[PDB]
Amino acid sequence: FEPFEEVKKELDLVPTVPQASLARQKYVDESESAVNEQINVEYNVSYVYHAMFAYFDRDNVALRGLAKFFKESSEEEREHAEKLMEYQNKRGGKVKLQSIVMPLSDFDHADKGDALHAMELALSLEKLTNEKLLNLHSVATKNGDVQLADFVETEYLGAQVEAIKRISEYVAQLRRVGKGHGVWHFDQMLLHE
Amino acid sequence: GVIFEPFEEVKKELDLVPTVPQASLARQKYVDESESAVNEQINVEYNVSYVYHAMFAYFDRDNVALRGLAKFFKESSEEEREHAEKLMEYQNKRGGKVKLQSIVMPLSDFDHADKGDALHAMELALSLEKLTNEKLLNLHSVATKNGDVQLADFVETEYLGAQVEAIKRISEYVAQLRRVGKGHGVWHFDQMLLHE
Amino acid sequence: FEPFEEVKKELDLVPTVPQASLARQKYVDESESAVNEQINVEYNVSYVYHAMFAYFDRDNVALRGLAKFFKESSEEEREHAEKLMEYQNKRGGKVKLQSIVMPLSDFDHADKGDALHAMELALSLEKLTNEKLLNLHSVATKNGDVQLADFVETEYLGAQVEAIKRISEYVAQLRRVGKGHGVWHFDQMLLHE
Amino acid sequence: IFEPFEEVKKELDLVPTVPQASLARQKYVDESESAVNEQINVEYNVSYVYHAMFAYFDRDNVALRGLAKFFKESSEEEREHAEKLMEYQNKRGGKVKLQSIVMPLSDFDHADKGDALHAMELALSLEKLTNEKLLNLHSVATKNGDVQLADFVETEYLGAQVEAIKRISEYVAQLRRVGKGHGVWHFDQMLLHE
Ligand SMILES: [Ca+2]
Ligand SMILES: [Ca+2]
Ligand SMILES: [Ca+2]
Ligand SMILES: [Ca+2]
Ligand SMILES: [Ca+2]
Ligand SMILES: [Ca+2]
Ligand SMILES: [Ca+2]
Ligand SMILES: [Ca+2]
Ligand SMILES: [Ca+2]
Ligand SMILES: [Ca+2]
Ligand SMILES: [Ca+2]
Ligand SMILES: [Ca+2]
Ligand SMILES: [Ca+2]
Ligand SMILES: [Ca+2]
Ligand SMILES: [Ca+2]
Ligand SMILES: [Ca+2]
Ligand SMILES: [Ca+2]
Ligand SMILES: [Ca+2]
Ligand SMILES: [Ca+2]
Ligand SMILES: [Ca+2]
Ligand SMILES: [Ca+2]
Numbered sequence: 069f070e071p072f073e074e075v076k077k078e079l080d081l082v083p084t085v086p087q088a089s090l091a092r093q094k095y096v097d098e099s100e101s102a103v104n105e106q107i108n109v110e111y112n113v114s115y116v117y118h119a120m121f122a123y124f125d126r127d128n129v130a131l132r133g134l135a136k137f138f139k140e141s142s143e144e145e146r147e148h149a150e151k152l153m154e155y156q157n158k159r160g161g162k163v164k165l166q167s168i169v170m171p172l173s174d175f176d177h178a179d180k181g182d183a184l185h186a187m188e189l190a191l192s193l194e195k196l197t198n199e200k201l202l203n204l205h206s207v208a209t210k211n212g213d214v215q216l217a218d219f220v221e222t223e224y225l226g227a228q229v230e231a232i233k234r235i236s237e238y239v240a241q242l243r244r245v246g247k248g249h250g251v252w253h254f255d256q257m258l259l260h261e
Numbered sequence: 262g263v264i265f266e267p268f269e270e271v272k273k274e275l276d277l278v279p280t281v282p283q284a285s286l287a288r289q290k291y292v293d294e295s296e297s298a299v300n301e302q303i304n305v306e307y308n309v310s311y312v313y314h315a316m317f318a319y320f321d322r323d324n325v326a327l328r329g330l331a332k333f334f335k336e337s338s339e340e341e342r343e344h345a346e347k348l349m350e351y352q353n354k355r356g357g358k359v360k361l362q363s364i365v366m367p368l369s370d371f372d373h374a375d376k377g378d379a380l381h382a383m384e385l386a387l388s389l390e391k392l393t394n395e396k397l398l399n400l401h402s403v404a405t406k407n408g409d410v411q412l413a414d415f416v417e418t419e420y421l422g423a424q425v426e427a428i429k430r431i432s433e434y435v436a437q438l439r440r441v442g443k444g445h446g447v448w449h450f451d452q453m454l455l456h457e
Numbered sequence: 458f459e460p461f462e463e464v465k466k467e468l469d470l471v472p473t474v475p476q477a478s479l480a481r482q483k484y485v486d487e488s489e490s491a492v493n494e495q496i497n498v499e500y501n502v503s504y505v506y507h508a509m510f511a512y513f514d515r516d517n518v519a520l521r522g523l524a525k526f527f528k529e530s531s532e533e534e535r536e537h538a539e540k541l542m543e544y545q546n547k548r549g550g551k552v553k554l555q556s557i558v559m560p561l562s563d564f565d566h567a568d569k570g571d572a573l574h575a576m577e578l579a580l581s582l583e584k585l586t587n588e589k590l591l592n593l594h595s596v597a598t599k600n601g602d603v604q605l606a607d608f609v610e611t612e613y614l615g616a617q618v619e620a621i622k623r624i625s626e627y628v629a630q631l632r633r634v635g636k637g638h639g640v641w642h643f644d645q646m647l648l649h650e
Numbered sequence: 651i652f653e654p655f656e657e658v659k660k661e662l663d664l665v666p667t668v669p670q671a672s673l674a675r676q677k678y679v680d681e682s683e684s685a686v687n688e689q690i691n692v693e694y695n696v697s698y699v700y701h702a703m704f705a706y707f708d709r710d711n712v713a714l715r716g717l718a719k720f721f722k723e724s725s726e727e728e729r730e731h732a733e734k735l736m737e738y739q740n741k742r743g744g745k746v747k748l749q750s751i752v753m754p755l756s757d758f759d760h761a762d763k764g765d766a767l768h769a770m771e772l773a774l775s776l777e778k779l780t781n782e783k784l785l786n787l788h789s790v791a792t793k794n795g796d797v798q799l800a801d802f803v804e805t806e807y808l809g810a811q812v813e814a815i816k817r818i819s820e821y822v823a824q825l826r827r828v829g830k831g832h833g834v835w836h837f838d839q840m841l842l843h844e
Contacts, residue, residue, distance in 0.1 A: 069688070070752055071695050071776060078775035086826075090819035093778050094785070105264060112267050158816045166262045192274040193267060195289055199274075200265075202290070205410055214788055215812055218804040221414040229287075229411055233354045233516050236286035239278075240519035241641060250638040257645065279517070283565060287516040301652070308654050311554065318542050318552035323480040324472070335539075342535070349511050359511035361504065364557040365653055372476060388661040389654060391676050395661075398677070401797055417801040425674075425798055429741045432673035435665075 092160025099216055100161035102207040107152045108166045109200045113193055114145030119171040120186055131252075133259030134183060141190075148224075155219060181247040183255065184239070191235045198228045288356025295412055296357035298403040303348045304362040305396045309389055310341030315367035316382055327447075329455030330379060337386070344420070351415055379447045380438040387431045394424045481549025488605050489550035491596040496541045497555045498589045502582055503534035508560040509575055520640075522648030523572055530579075537613070544608055572640045573631040580624045587617045675743025682799050683744035685790040690735045691749040692783045696776055697728035702754040703769055714835075716842030717766055724773070731807070738802055766834045767825040774818045781811045 083090055121138035124131045156163045177185030201224050208216040238258075245254050279286055313334045320331035352359045373381035397420050404412035434454070441450050472479055506527045513524035545552045566574035590613050597605040627647070634643050666673055700721045707718035739746045760768035784807050791799040821841070828837050 069691055069695055069749075071699050071779065072755055075772070075775045075779050078779050079771060081778075082771055082775065082822075090774065090822050091816045093781060093815065108265050112265055116267055158812050160816070160819070166264050169263055169266050169268075172268055188275065188278055189271070191286060192271040192278060195277075196267065196271050196274045198289060202410065214785060214804065215808040218808060221410065222418075225411040225414060226418075229354050232289065233287045233356075236356070236516035237519040237521075239286055240517050244519070245638045245641050250641070253638065253642065282517065283563075285515065285517050304652055308652055311557075312654050314539075314542075315552075315554050318546065318554070321543065321546045322478065322551070323546065323549055324475060324478050346507075349507075350514065353511065353514045353516065356516055358515070358562065359508075360562045361508050361511065361560055363559045363651070364504075365651070365655075366556045367554055368655060369551065369553045384665050385658070385662065387673060388658045388665060391661045392654065392658050394676060398797060417797065418805075421798045421801060422805075425741050428676065429674045429743075432743070435673050439669075 089160030089162075091158070095159045095161055095213065095216075096211050098207055099211055099213050100156070100159075102204045103152055103156050103159075103161060103216075104164045104166070106200060106204045107149050107156070107163065108168070109197060110145055110149035110152060111165070112168055113197055114142050114149060115168050116171045116193060117142035117145055117190075119173055120175060120190070123173065123175045124182075124186070129182065131183060131255045133255035133257065133261075134186065137258050138186075138190075151223065155223075159216070181251060183251045184242040184247075187235060187238045187242055191232070191239055194228065194232050194235055198225075198232065201225060201228055285356030285358075287354070291355045291357055291409065291412070292407050294407055295404060295409050296352065296355075298400050299348055299352050299355075299357060299412075300360045300362070302396060302400045303345050303352070303359065304364070305393060306341055306345035306348060307361070308364055309393055310338050310345060311364050312367045312389060313338035313341055313386075315369060316371060316386070319369065319371045320378075320382070325378065327379060327451045329451035329453065329457075330382065333454055334382075334386075347419060351419075355412070377438075377443040377447060379451065380435065380443075383431060383434045383438055387428070387435055390424065390428050390431055394421075394428060397421060397424055478549030478551075480547070484548045484550060484602065484605070485600050487596060488600055488602050489545070489548075491593050492541060492545050492548075492550060492605070493553045493555070495589060495593045496538050496545070496552065497557070498586060499534055499538035499541060500554070501557055501560075502586055503531050503538060504557050505560045505582060506531035506534055506579070508562060509564060509579070512562065512564045513571075513575070518571060520572060520644045522644035522646065522650075523575065526647055527575075527579075540612060544612075548605070570631075570636040570640060572644065573628065573636075576624060576627045576631055580621070580628055583617065583621050583624055587614075587621060590614060590617055672743030672745075674741070678742045678744060678796065678799075679794050681790060682794055682796050683739065683742075685787050686735055686739050686742075686744060686799075687747045687749070689783060689787045690732050690739070690746065691751070692780060693728055693732035693735065694748070695751055695754075696780055697725050697732060698751050699754045699776060700725035700728055700773075702756055703758060703773070706756065706758045707765075707769070712765065714766060714838045716838035716840065716844075717769065720841055720844075721769075721773075734806060738806075742799070764825075764830040764834060766838065767822065767830075770818060770821045770825055774815070774822055777811065777815050777818055781808075781815065784808060784811055 117138045121135050121142060123129060124135035124138060153163045175186045175189070176182045180188070201220060205217055205220045205225070208220060238254075241254055242251065245251060317331050317334035317338055319325060320327045320334060349359050371382045371385070372378050376384070397416060401413055401416045401421070404410075404416060434450075437450055438447060441447060509527035510524050510531060512518060513520045513527060542552045564575045564578070565571045569577070590609060594606055594609045594614070597603075597609060627643075630643055631640065634640060704718055704721035704725055706712060707714045707721060736746050758769045758772070759765045763771065784803060788800055788803045788808070791803060821837075824837055824840075825834060828834060
């Protein structure tokens with residue numbers, strides 16, 4: 069091994085124009101795009117959770133535990149997006165934030181009750197996010213990006229499994245306690261959890 | 262530039278949420294073969310825990326009196342049970358159902374005239390750790406073959422690195438026991454282990 | 458009393474073969490065997506409780522208080538087995554661990570509800586263990602082993618009575634609160650007890 | 651049904667007897683052992699090059715104390731990268747074989763770029779080369795089916811390598827922005843106190 073002989077083809081590949089990443093290495097456009105797509109997925113879920121917070125924070129709904137949970141969840145989802153934005157820049161890809169569509173605003177449900185409906189929606193959104201994460205992982209693996217696949221596994225896939233179980237447990241408890249007094253009590257639990 | 266519509270895309274995720282009470286709500290892309298393989302590994306770890314407990318019980322005998330080895334095997338048994346429990350918790354995180362299986366009777370006596378009890382037991386422990394490593398790698402192969410990305414990662418992250426460390430650690434014990442020789446040497450090594 | 462006269466009959470009986478216990482004194486094979494049986498009983502209950510924990514830790518069951526209680530109980534039970542293994546060695550008996558059978562995996566019950574059913578099962582297991590402990594004490598007394606009897610009463614019988622009252626109270630409370638909200642509430646109490 | 655005492659037989663009589671043989675080694679093929687040794691030499695060589703760069707920037711007539719400190723610290727860290735692989739080799743029961751280290755360049759001045767920018771561009775290229783080498787090592791592991799070696803490379807090296815590449819890229823970018831003379835000296839003061 070001769071660093072100065074083998075580093076030559078590396079020093080000649082150092083970008084000249086100011087707009088090109090100096091760090092980018094073995095990071096293909098398809099991977100860059102998939103990371104941007106996931107940033108948009110996380111940001112969308114953040115926005116949906118913020119909508120759910122705004123619903124449960126209504127005076128006539130008055131489920132303070134669920135409001136707090138969705139408010140904190142929204143904040144956490146934004147962090148998930150930001151971590152991906154930072155990762156994008158670590159790899160020398162360019163972050164491209166995309167539009168975020170209007171979420172629903174009302175989360176009432178006659179049969180299920182608002183709490184259960186909202187938690188079932190949250191569970192489905194977390195499972196949807198997991199599918200998107202597995203897709204980002206598929207793009208990494210298809211393109212042979214070893215470090216991207218590891219990043220997704222280490223920072224996202226495990227936590228997503230945990231998030232899914234946590235919400236699943238909420239759905240289960242909400243189904244057990246039933247509407248009315250039980251839901252209010254579950255909400256108190258969540259308020260103080 | 263709209264590339265994702267959560268409320269349109271969850272629709273299929275919503276009408277897939279179980280209604281029957283015995284069904285997991287969390288389970289997602291976790292196939293029966295993976296679930297079974299995790300149950301099998303739980304039983305592997307629990308068996309090893311029981312075997313180490315048998316070894317503790319032997320070295321704790323008044324006439325054997327190797328307190329460092331007894332302590333090591335006792336702590337190893339507890340750690341192995343933790344390895345089993347972490348897999349049990351993982352099963353439930355993935356929405357699989359834990360099924361504890363029977364645990365076979367271990368040997369009770371670990372004497373060996375030629376090698377000496379201490380070296381014999383450490384070589385046995387080494388072989389058990391290597392066997393467990395093989396089982397773990399087999400569990401990993403099941404995940405990779407079925408394309409379970411997160412199960413493969415769990416196994417690598419939580420088990421494989423530690424297993425390599427456990428194997429080197431016990432290998433070092435075997436080497437030292439061989440170096441010090443039977444009698445005074447083994448007793449001294451045991452004192453070291455007792456205070457390690 | 459002449460220690461050195463009375464002792465020469467005890468000094469020449471000190472075992473010489475390395476496989477023989479030096480400590481063992483007035484400890485008959487039946488007592489040694491009965492101690493090994495109780496070790497297996499305690500270990501079996503540890504395993505059953507671990508199976509109970511694994512059931513209540515399911516996302517769709519989501520009774521965190523019961524899950525925690527059975528998890529801690531499994532650990533406590535293994536400690537009960539271990540203390541008997543150590544006792545065996547104190548008396549110069551040889552520990553022989555035996556097979557542990559596969560326990561039930563599922564604990565749902567349509568009529569009683571899962572929580573009440575599992576607590577009634579736990580109560581029955583503790584009563585069975587008590588019967589086994591009293592049988593062990595009986596073996597000790599039949600054989601005139603004074604210190605084995607003492608060890609069982611001091612270390613096991615009192616604790617067993619407390620465990621049985623504790624679980625009986627859980628059963629009673631579960632019956633009082635009823636299924637649904639009540640069970641979930643009881644579970645919260647247990648979670649924080 | 652799992653029977654530890656039956657299945658352990660295969661392994662129990664595979665336990666090596668000769669003092670020279672690893673007791674730990676399991677599913678670790680010669681090609682992986684060799685590739686780990688190669689990477690040890692890669693890291694050690696980069697450590698040596700950074701030490702050469704330290705020695706240049708520490709010259710009284712160059713007097714870029716921030717860059718000197720940065721390269722000195724980088725040299726020590728690179729030696730730690732080498733040593734972690736040496737320890738890993740022993741964890742897996744492979745035999746460490748240290749190789750020769752070639753003479754590095756001693757002077758890092760550059761008429762057009764200026765010494766600071768040239769040295770940082772060189773460092774960036776060295777880190778990218780090391781990344782390619784690490785990915786090669788990972789490829790050897792994957793090709794040979796060594797699950798734990800691949801995991802070790804990803805966990806201990808690849809993420810850190812990405813961070814080191816971004817870090818030095820940022821230095822190159824800043825040196826380009828501030829330009830030669832007062833700007834470089836000021837960047838150097840920043841790095842000195844970083
Ligand atoms: Ca998320
Ligand atoms: Ca932030
Ligand atoms: Ca942040
Ligand atoms: Ca571009
Ligand atoms: Ca939990
Ligand atoms: Ca283990
Ligand atoms: Ca634990
Ligand atoms: Ca535990
Ligand atoms: Ca099933
Ligand atoms: Ca990993
Ligand atoms: Ca007990
Ligand atoms: Ca203990
Ligand atoms: Ca203890
Ligand atoms: Ca006997
Ligand atoms: Ca008494
Ligand atoms: Ca009381
Ligand atoms: Ca390095
Ligand atoms: Ca060091
Ligand atoms: Ca060799
Ligand atoms: Ca990995
Ligand atoms: Ca930074």
